[PDB]
Amino acid sequence: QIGPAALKAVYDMARKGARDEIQTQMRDGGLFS
Amino acid sequence: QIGPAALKAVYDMARKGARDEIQTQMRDGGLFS
Amino acid sequence: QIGPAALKAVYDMARKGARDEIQTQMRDGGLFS
Amino acid sequence: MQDIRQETLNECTRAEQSASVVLWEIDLTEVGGERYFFCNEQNEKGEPVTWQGRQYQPYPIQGSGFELNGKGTSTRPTLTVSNLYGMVTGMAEDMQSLVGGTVVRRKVYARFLDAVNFVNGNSYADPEQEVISRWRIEQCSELSAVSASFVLSTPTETDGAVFPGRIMLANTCTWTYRGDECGYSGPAVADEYDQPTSDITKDKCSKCLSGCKFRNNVGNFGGFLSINKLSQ
Amino acid sequence: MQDIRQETLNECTRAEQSASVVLWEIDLTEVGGERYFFCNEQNEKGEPVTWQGRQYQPYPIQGSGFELNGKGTSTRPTLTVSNLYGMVTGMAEDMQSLVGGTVVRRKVYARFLDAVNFVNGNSYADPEQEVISRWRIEQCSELSAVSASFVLSTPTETDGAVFPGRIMLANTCTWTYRGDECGYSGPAVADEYDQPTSDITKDKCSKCLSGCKFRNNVGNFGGFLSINKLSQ
Amino acid sequence: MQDIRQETLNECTRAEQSASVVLWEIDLTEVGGERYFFCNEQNEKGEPVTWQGRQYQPYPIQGSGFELNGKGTSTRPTLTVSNLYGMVTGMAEDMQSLVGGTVVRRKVYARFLDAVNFVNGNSYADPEQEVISRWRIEQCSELSAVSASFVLSTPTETDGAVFPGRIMLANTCTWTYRGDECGYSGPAVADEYDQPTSDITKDKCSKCLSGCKFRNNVGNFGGFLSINKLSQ
Amino acid sequence: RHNAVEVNWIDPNNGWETATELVEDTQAIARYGRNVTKMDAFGCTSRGQ
Amino acid sequence: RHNAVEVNWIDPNNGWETATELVEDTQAIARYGRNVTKMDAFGCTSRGQ
Amino acid sequence: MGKGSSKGHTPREAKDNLKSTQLLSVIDAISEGPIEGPVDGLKSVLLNST
Amino acid sequence: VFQIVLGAAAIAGSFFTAGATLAAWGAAIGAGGMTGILFSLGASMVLGGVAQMLAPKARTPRIQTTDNGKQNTYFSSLDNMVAQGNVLPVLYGEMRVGSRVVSQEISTADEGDGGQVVVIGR
Amino acid sequence: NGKQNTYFSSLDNMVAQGNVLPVLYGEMRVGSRVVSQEISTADEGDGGQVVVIGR
Amino acid sequence: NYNPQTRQYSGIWDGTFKPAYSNNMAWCLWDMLTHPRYGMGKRLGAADVDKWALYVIGQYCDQSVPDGFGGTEPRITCNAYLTTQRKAWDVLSDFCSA
Ligand code: SF4
Ligand code: SF4
Numbered sequence A, B, C: 001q002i003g004p005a006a007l008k009a010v011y012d013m014a015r016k017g018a019r020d021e022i023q024t025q026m027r028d029g030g031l032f033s
Numbered sequence D, E, F: 001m002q003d004i005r006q007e008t009l010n011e012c013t014r015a016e017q018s019a020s021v022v023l024w025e026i027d028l029t030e031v032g033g034e035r036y037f038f039c040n041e042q043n044e045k046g047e048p049v050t051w052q053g054r055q056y057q058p059y060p061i062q063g064s065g066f067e068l069n070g071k072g073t074s075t076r077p078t079l080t081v082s083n084l085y086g087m088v089t090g091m092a093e094d095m096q097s098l099v100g101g102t103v104v105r106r107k108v109y110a111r112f113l114d115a116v117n118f119v120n121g122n123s124y125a126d127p128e129q130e131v132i133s134r135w136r137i138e139q140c141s142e143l144s145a146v147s148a149s150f151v152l153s154t155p156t157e158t159d160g161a162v163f164p165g166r167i168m169l170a171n172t173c174t175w176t177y178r179g180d181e182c183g184y185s186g187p188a189v190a191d192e193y194d195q196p197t198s199d200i201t202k203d204k205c206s207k208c209l210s211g212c213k214f215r216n217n218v219g220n221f222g223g224f225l226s227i228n229k230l231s232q
Numbered sequence G, H: 001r002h003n004a005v006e007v008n009w010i011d012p013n014n015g016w017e018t019a020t021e022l023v024e025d026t027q028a029i030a031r032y033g034r035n036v037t038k039m040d041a042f043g044c045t046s047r048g049q
Numbered sequence I: 001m002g003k004g005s006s007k008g009h010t011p012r013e014a015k016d017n018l019k020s021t022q023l024l025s026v027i028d029a030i031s032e033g034p035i036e037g038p039v040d041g042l043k044s045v046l047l048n049s050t
Numbered sequence J: 001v002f003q004i005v006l007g008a009a010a011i012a013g014s015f016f017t018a019g020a021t022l023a024a025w026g027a028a029i030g031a032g033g034m035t036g037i038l039f040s041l042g043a044s045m046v047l048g049g050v051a052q053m054l055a056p057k058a059r060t061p062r063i064q065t066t067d068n069g070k071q072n073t074y075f076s077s078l079d080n081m082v083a084q085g086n087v088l089p090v091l092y093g094e095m096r097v098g099s100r101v102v103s104q105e106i107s108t109a110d111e112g113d114g115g116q117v118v119v120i121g122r
Numbered sequence K: 001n002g003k004q005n006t007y008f009s010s011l012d013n014m015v016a017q018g019n020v021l022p023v024l025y026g027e028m029r030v031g032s033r034v035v036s037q038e039i040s041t042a043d044e045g046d047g048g049q050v051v052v053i054g055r
Numbered sequence L: 001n002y003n004p005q006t007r008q009y010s011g012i013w014d015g016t017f018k019p020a021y022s023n024n025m026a027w028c029l030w031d032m033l034t035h036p037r038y039g040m041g042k043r044l045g046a047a048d049v050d051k052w053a054l055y056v057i058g059q060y061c062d063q064s065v066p067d068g069f070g071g072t073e074p075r076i077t078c079n080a081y082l083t084t085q086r087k088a089w090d091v092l093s094d095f096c097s098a
């Protein structure tokens, strides 16, 4: 795995994780993020 | 590193990082996320 | 890629992505995170 | 401590245990469909798995996110199934994307399965040995030419609900037509546009005062015909 | 559907198509600068690319994040350029980090480029074939010894704006000096410290009532000289 | 600019420098414990490192997250230590998980360490060369059969504090018993249940008005014995 | 998939005050349970709007 | 690890208004500094509760 | 004095010299569904604060 | 071949990820049956306090400066509130309550109470 | 209506139950937290000996 | 088998609810969860909420504890007046926190 192409993929997956986690924290109990 | 198993692990680490950061931002200065 | 060194790098990339995302969601439409 | 039999706890503590199969059931009766029984595996004779006398057809299906937790969001499982040959697609265009259906999940040790599934028979078969869970379908998250994914939710899920619910209104009825609170049982009178009809399939209340008067039900009107002037 | 010609539509549907070049233009005229034209590539003769009679100089430049969406945040593209030899640096120290400039991006199929760019000439050269987009520079995000990065934004971007904007004040004028609402056109009278001056370059209203009186403009005063006592 | 000596500044700028050792001290005196001195390394003679005449025992320990920043959250460092042989465990069950302890870090160039640590001696030893930092323990984040982790924090950390703090109450005293504001110094009278006692170890105020009356301290009562009726 | 809505408009007839208008789809309430929302009709001053 | 709590209940004796009851643990206030919270006892109308 | 219905009716003082009497007729809305009712009776109807 | 299960030191510094060294897991990448990155919920679940893991910690209404210093709750009301688009309410045992005024009409009363005998003035 | 409030002033007499007392830092014209309020009948006379009820 | 006036249970319950006025906060929560008219009874419904858990909870909440004024008092009680429409999660969390 080359560093250049892997780091951007990791960053984009992390941003998608932030999407999903904020949206799921706006649910009932959660934290409202 | 196979792509299938690596992407799920990276996504779960991203979700954990989002949890940790959102909870960190609810501190004094922070951003209240 | 060794697991030890890679997991921390992934975690830190995830934290940085969460920072960028929380900051970009406080923009006009966004969701205010 | 789940109400699970002693044989299951005997099998759980063994060093070398039998395979733990999971059988899924999709129940769309309450939404207008049938009950489908699925298992990810066949049996040793290449046939759908027979459990408690019911045949669970072979079909690729597996779930994740199953947990029991109270602190935080209500747990939302996820069920992934195969959409090859357009089966789920057919149900999605038919049963409003299966939304509102009931997913029942059974965990059963293969040791306790019916003797039919095995060539030599199962002297240890015990159809009472199972662990059951129920969930609802909240959203068909993905549906492609390859597979389908469903988000499950606990049947309680107090997400969009509010309390108290009944709302004060003027010139509108909050009761359900011909419901217990409405209390109406008369013949067809008019539709939702207050047009006089004698057809039972076109008989709905307009929810306005005139609609109530058409049925002589004004005493049961759900609105409050004074509050419009006190709020000025 | 974008206002794009039929030749581009014909070229888009072909199996084997020519290269799609992107030409960038930086316009700092509205902020006090010139217009620069860039392309990531030269042409076959080793010269800056000639499009519609204009020479776009060779320089490493590439954009990303270009999309058309309505739901959510207004899209913020990004433009990465080379800062070897300190060119962008020179602009940043000169043009307030290029903030407020206009970035124009053109997509052109190489088949439609001017015949100058090719050794054998271009029979299909058609200077009307292009797809144009405009953006503004919001922040020079990075500027190192190697490269520079700019954040782009749509020209609307209602981020820091409020509505309504005009504010009720006492002892201060919200009008723009010598503007249409202010309506002043007289000679130089005083500076922002109410000191009498006859110099046109040192003539600015103090925005207080005395500054307005200096110009006999109290009828056009932007403030309200009664509201300070009613708010007590 | 930190109050650090000129020898350390001379050593920092050298191309080839000595090792920079970090010595840790855990002070639990203010929570009821002793002081433990730790270093991740031994010296060349296989003995605990002698610095300024104090022996820092060998033990695996290292910290991270140390920074000096003002914008944002107050920095929370972390300290990871070895929990083999159940040492930290023994302290955690003893000293309320070390919560409230003081962690002192010292950065020292090995060039300035005492001559004891070296076989040939250190003619350059200078016990005044050190960089000190203090932190508090906030939570023992992890404690397993292998290691332990602690979340340090700055001693200020205005996280759960409020201002102003004193609260107006009726039928309750907000003063500290026998404190300066309470000003009481009499003999044992009663316990927190207003039961008369002559025992000094069972003498605590009930914080109610009757408890104050038991000690003839009603002048110093921290409550306000009129506000209950004005709030109706 | 909401089935009941409470729209807040301003009546110019009774008095220039906020009136709530309830819109329901009883056919869909028999299908997706009953999901209710509140909306503020921005320029509405007429019951029909 | 909070050591002081202010509970908001409703007194039915003085008048049906909100009264604040302060609960402290002076032993713990000598250990973990002093951490205070505010709580709303949902059904409480009695000082003891 | 009942469950599900009540009448109250403390009497009005007889007038001295003619005159009209203004009347204040109100209807309140409390709770939902069947309720137990007043704690005591007419002693649990505080007109202003009495 | 193992369960890794990231703890709290591994996520806080690349310290004990190299402790277990994850050599077998890393060289084996993983498998379908066994899942990595378990991320034990020790510290995260207890951030708000232990008492939050046992009770949901009911909230309190937003403080309004308009009330001088009066404290309001979410389970009482001594005021006659407007009764349009406002939900009726719910009362659970005892309590002294306000109301949602359905009607209010000031008019002229009519002489007499019941029976037959009526005297206008005496 | 349109009155703007700050976090460092108060000109009203607020309720003094569960409210924290306050804090004032130099000068300023202040409201208060009413601790007591009692309307009663005053007693004739101010001091000394001589008192006249009415004249 | 529960008499709300004396707050005393007779014996085994076997279900079979009864329409009586009680201050037992557990059954106030039960009514909040499973009432079709105004509560959460249309969604959810009965057989989804553990009634025996609420039974034991109510028995626990009915125990006698020192009053603080020399008497005795039930452990936990109702007397809420919910007037503002909050989310069902909010009301459920308040009931499960009391
Ligand atoms: S208006 Fe009358 S008839 Fe129509 S639904 Fe309401 S109560 Fe029933
Ligand atoms: S104060 Fe008078 S002269 Fe000055 S800007 Fe305003 S309107 Fe113009």
Ligand code: SF4
Residues within 6 Å of the ligand: F173, F174, F175, F176, F177, F178, F181, F182, F183, F184, F205, F206, F207, F208, F209, F211, F212, F213, F215, F217, F218, F220, F221, F222
């Ligand atoms: S009530 Fe009186 S004796 Fe007790 S702590 Fe307060 S001031 Fe001291």
